[model samples]
Every structure is written in C-alpha cells, then in structure tokens.
Target: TSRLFALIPCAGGSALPKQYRTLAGRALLHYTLAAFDACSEFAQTLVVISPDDAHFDARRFAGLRFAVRRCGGASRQASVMNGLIQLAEFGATDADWVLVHDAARPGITPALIRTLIGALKDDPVGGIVALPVADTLKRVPAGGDAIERTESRNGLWQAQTPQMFRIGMLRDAIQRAQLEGRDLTDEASAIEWAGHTPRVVQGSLRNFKVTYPEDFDLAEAILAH
Candidate 1:
C-alpha cells in the first residue's frame, strides 16, 4: 500500500483567529487535529502554519506523530501546495495518498476519516467527504447581497472536510493551474481543471467547518454530546 499522510493548512484565522480560539477549553485546531491523530493510519501528519503566525498553539498538538512546517502561504491552496512539496521531502511520493483537512473543522471523527479513506484507497481518482446541497441556493448580484436568481440545486453538493488525493496528482494539478494564473476554488476544482473528476462520498453535515462565532458553541455542544 502507498503511504498515507495528513496535511493541515493551519494558517487560517480570524480576530485572534478562531483556530486559536478555545473550544471546550482547548484550541479548535486541537480538536480538528485530534480526529486525525486518533486514526493512527497515517505515516505522519504534517501541519502547515504561517511563518509569522503569533497565535499558533504548539501545546495543542501534544502526543501525536506529527510535524509542523512554517511554509504556509497566503491562501488555502497555496498552503496546500507548499505542504505537498514538503511532504515529498518527508518521504511521500506521488503515489502516496494525502488528506488535506481544514483547521476550523473541529468536528471530524476517526470514523469519518476511515470511511473516506476506505472509499478512496484503491480509487484511480481520489475523493472527498461531502453532502448534497440541502437548502435551495441563490445567486446574488455582484457587489451586492440581493438575490439575483434561484440556482437550480440539481447535481450540486456541499463540500466538506478531508479532501483526499494522491500527492503527485494534486501537486501537478495545482501547479498547472498556478502556471496558467488561473485562480482555483479548492483542491477538487484544481483536480477538475486538470481534466480529472474527483469522486464525492456521502458525509455527514456534522463535519461542517466552524466559521461564525456562534458556531464554536454549536460545535462544542455537538461534540460534547
């Protein structure tokens, strides 16, 4: 089996950065990373944080087979790309599988991680955990909040955590997009832009990325249950 690795773009933040914010008396990133730590399948988990990050909590990552890198970039994709490059130096090959998880999604569980990996372990094209759009989505006019039109929700899915792909494939995909100066939306989109269709396995909404201030409590409450 090809080596499996986990990479977290931990450069994300808000006022004091929600990632550093305490949830259940622990940093949100602690919970986010803990899920992967519980898996015990990864050869190693690499966390990418900004070089100048003043709010990162090192103690939050205690007791895990993890390494931290300070090469995070300005955007999520950039951070992912940088981390992928580092993974290569860390003994990961193009055939190795990499799971890129969000720092704000603290609700991830060991069960979900295994489910995602099981579905894509032997897949020619890797996949992500996601749920189909549940609520009707609307398109808003540019520079305004007013609804422009109701978008047809058919065939639309809401992407969530643990976007998985082969390290080499995703690196090349993102590199190609960057070379063309094409702005990418996410990892899977970069994969699509490279003429590959990423598969989506059914995932729970419980894995939602925590953003708003209230969401921390909601996340904590759900996690507490």
Candidate 2:
C-alpha cells in the first residue's frame, strides 16, 4: 500500500541475438521505463539487468523516482524471482503493491497503467492488463501443420502489463511455482497458480512486445501517434 514498484526484466543483452535485437534509434528498455515514469501511481522502478549489460547504466534512469539495478538470471521467470528477492531485502515488503511490466513492450500508455491499477484496486488477488482475442482461434494438432479445431474466444483474453499485485503474494507465487518446477510466462500466471484469478483490464493493440525486426517500426509509429 505504500509504494508501487515496477519490476522490469531486461533479460537480454544490449543487442539481443538475431531476432530480438533493439531498435536503431532507441533502446527497448528505456521506452518501457519512460512509460512507467510517466505514470502517476508507480512509486518506484527497478530494472533486472544482465551482469554484462554495459548499455544499462543506472545513471540513465536518474530522473526516475527510484531506479535500482539487480542482476537477472537466464530466464524471464528467473530474472523476476531475482528482482523480487532484492526488492524484498530492500524494504519492498512494506510496499503494498508491485507492477511487473516487460522491458520489451515499449508502447504501453500511461492511461493503460492508471486503468489497470484502478481495476486492480478491488481485486481479491491481483490484476493484469489484457485484451480479448478478437481474431479467430485455431488449434494445431500434434505432428500436423494445420488447425485441429476452432476454439471459442468468448472468455479468452490476451494478458498484458503492468500486472499489479501485493508484493509479498507475487514473490510467494513465483517462488512456489519455481519450487514446483512450473515454468511461468508472466506474473499473472504465477498468481493464478496460487489459487487466485487476476482480473483483466482491456488494453490496446499498440501495446505489444517487440520481438522481431518490424516491431520497432510499428512501435515508433504508434508512439508518434
């Protein structure tokens, strides 16, 4: 309830190998951090960087309210777990909430951040920003290249961030999942495994992860808009 921390994982190096490389004019991590900095409610921001990420100097985010760098692990889940421990050790326990957003997602808006936090204010467990699948769903069968079935998208939604939660609960959820040998793709998934459903706050298509070559261009266009 005290501080709302942004748990961002910079899992890759300055230049991610081949497919996930950074945009030419901008760093992917800085874009996401800027969005969080623009938000009204995020009290602190921390980046989980690789030990060898020379491009990620703490001075870059000196303008932010709070910016601390922790060394990340090999995977996204592992990196978050490492950050959570650092946060906990440094008095994040007193903070009521933490929002886990991805460093790769650069076009998230301040409006979406406020919206998700507002929606989660009443959540029993926690909440995440997501969008419903408006496109047709197809399931591929084993050993096949085609759709085995057409699925309904009535209750389906694509999860986004900043995923807001009680800091302690989130740490517990991720730790438990790790202990159980469960691979979690997001903070919301870890909370779900803890027997709590995260409420979904609908987000825009512009707010997408940058994983390929063309994504940077798309993000730049969206930001220009």
Candidate 3:
C-alpha cells in the first residue's frame, strides 16, 4: 500500500520571511498546519528548516503530529529534496505519496486539503491545487512602454500549493533538474521537466500565498470565517 506524507519547506525568505510571523496574535504557519490537523490520514508531515534557524517554537504547533528537520537549503528545491531524503529516515517509502505545501498559505482549509487529495489520490502522474485564470491578458515585454497585445486567456491557470506526487518519482525528477543545473522551484515543474503531465485540481481564491503585507491580513480574514 502506498502511504501518504507531507513536507513544508519553511525556508521562507524576505523581511521576517512571513511564515513564522504572527497574524492577529497567532502564528501564520499555525493556520497552515491546522488545515492538515488530525485530518484525513497523512502518516507524517515534515517541516524542513534551515540548519542555523532558531525561530520555530515547537510549542506553537500542538495539534498536529509533525517532525522538524534542520536540513533546509538556500533554494526551495534543495530544501524539498533534502526533506525527501530525511523522510526516508522517518519510515517513508519510495512509493509513498508526498504532498508539498507552502507554509505561507494560511488560507488552506481542511475541506480544500481533502478536495485536492480526493482528486489526485489515484492519479497516475499526480498534480497540484490550482485555479483557472479569469483575468484579461496583456502581453508586455521588458523595456516596452505599451502593451504589445492582449493574448488569449484560454488554458491559463494560477498554480497553488499542496502539490502531491510519489516520493520516488518526485525525488528523481528534482535530482535530474539539479544535475542539469536547472532551477525548478516547484515539484510539479520538476515533474513536468521529466516529461510527465501534471493535473490541476481546483483550488480556492483564499489559498493565496502571503507575500504582500496585505495578504497577512487577508489570511486573518479567512481564519475569522
């Protein structure tokens, strides 16, 4: 039987990085973890951190059964691969399914998590949570003063997190990219480079990454729901 696991690379960068920050007194990552809280059965959820990191407080995450690994790297891809290696030590098998999530997306809910899993659990190539684009398109090139033209918005999607794939295949895909000196920031990108198609499971608008300052407050608004 293929087991299921999760990995959140908390090597979040930028001013205070945003992942470990507080949103209305509660930790941002806390909300993200709570989405996977006591849920639908993931054998383990590993949070990968930097080796010299000192910000995480284990006491903050009391509801979830998570493991911490101080093996994060400079790049998100490296952190993910390192976490995959460490998952082996935690009894994860190569064929086991692994979901890679972003700690910044505090808007993730239990229902959304289940939706993604339900859609991709039996998928042969695995997939990610994403939403189809609904905005008008404009083609603007660098150093251009005006919009070149409006392009077709057909088939465009906004990629979200909790990208799931088998541990063995995902690791191999990332390794190939690493050896070839390519930087694929997401597992789905790596998987695509390996000539495998990835499916897009419907995602919610609230599942936005916490990059802008206003997004932190947006996440708070989501939690208040």
Candidate 4:
C-alpha cells in the first residue's frame, strides 16, 4: 500500500515569517494545515521549522494531529531533505508518497489535493500543480529597468504545490542537485534534474503564495469566498 505523507517546510526568512502572520483571523500556516488536515488520506503530516523559531504556538492548532520537527535548514531544499530524514525515523518507507507544500499558500483546498493524488497515485513519477502561462513573456537584462525583448510563452507553465513524489526518489534527486551545485527553487526542479518528468496537473489561480504584505489582503479576500 502506498501511504501518503505531507511535508511543510516553514523556515521562512521573511521579516515577519509570513507563515505565522494572520489571514482572516487565523495564522497563515493554520489554513495550510487546515487544508491538509481536512484530507485524512495522509498517514502523517509534518511541519518542519527552524530550531530557534519562537512564533509557532502548538495551542493554536489544538486538534490538528501534526508533528513538529525542529530540524529545518537554511534553504527550502535543505529543510525538505531534513524533513525526509525525520520522516524515515517515524517508520516512513522509501515508497511512501510525500506531498511537499508551502506554508504561505493558504488557498489550498482538499479537492485540489485529492485531484493531485488521483492523477499521480499510480504513475511512474509524481507531479505538481501547474498552470499554462496565459500572459505575455518578457526578458530583461540584469540591473536594467527596461525589457530587453518580448519572449514567447509557447510552452511556459507557472508551477505550484503540493509537489508530490516518492520519498526515495525525491531524496536522491535533492542530494544530487546539491552535489551538482544547482539552486533549486522547488522540489519538481530537483526531480527534473534527476532525469524524471513530473506530470503537470491543472491548478487553481486561487492557490497562490503570499510573498508580500499586500498578498495577505488578497489571500484574505480569496479565502473569504
């Protein structure tokens, strides 16, 4: 049987660490947890945080049933790898499915998660939530204020999460990426580097990450729906 596990890496470097910030009266991470918590398919839900993080309060998430790991690293890649090692300690096998989600994306719904799982559960390689680019593309030189050229958006995609992959496959890919000195912004990139093609499941525009202060208000408005 293929067990599902969720790994949320929360060692953000924001001034206020966006995950702890409230959106519509609850912490941002709260909704992220709420989404995964709604889906009981997961065998375990793990939140990886920095060892020195002082903002997370367990009392806020009373009945969520997730375990916290204080083994976060400097980057998202490192933190995820550390979380995988921790998952192994909890009897998680190499074949188990690990869904890597972002704490800042509070708009994740159970339906979206189920959609991802339903699409990739029996596949050779796992996949992620991605949307075909609909806007015009531009290329600008570094430190330049103007666009150097208008590029084509023929096969472009905007990637989102939770990017699902098998535990052993993802861990090996991440380690290989690190060894090759590649800067991976997401788990799918690592898997791609390992010569695996992850499928692109259609994702919702509502499922976006909150990076700036204004994003909080936008997320609040979206979640209000």
Q: Largest lDDT belongs to which candidate?
A: 4
What are the per-residue Cα lDDT tens digits for candidate 4 across 1-225?
999999999985547687888788888888878889999989889999999899889988878968899999988899999999899877899999999999878999999999999999998889999999999999988998799899999998999999999999999999998888899999999999999999999999999888887888899999967
lDDT of 3 by residue, 42-132 (tens): 8888999899777888998886678899999989999999999999998999889999999888888878888888888888889999989
Error of 3 at 131 (Å): 0.4
Model 1 deviation from native, Cα RMSD in Å: 1.9
Backbone Cα, N, C clashes tallied per candidate: 1, 1, 0, 0
Q: What lDDT does candidate 3 reach at residue 166?
A: 92
Q: What is the lDDT of residue 160 in candidate 1?
A: 83
Candidate 4's C-alpha runs over 4 A off are 12-14
lDDT scores of the candidates, listed in order: 0.87, 0.75, 0.87, 0.91
Single out the weakest 10-residue window by summed lDDT for candidate 1.
10-19
Residue pairs of candidate 3 with colliding backbone atoms: none
- Quote the positional error of residue 22 for candidate 4 in Å: 1.2
TM-score of candidate 4 on Cα atoms, chains taken together: 0.95
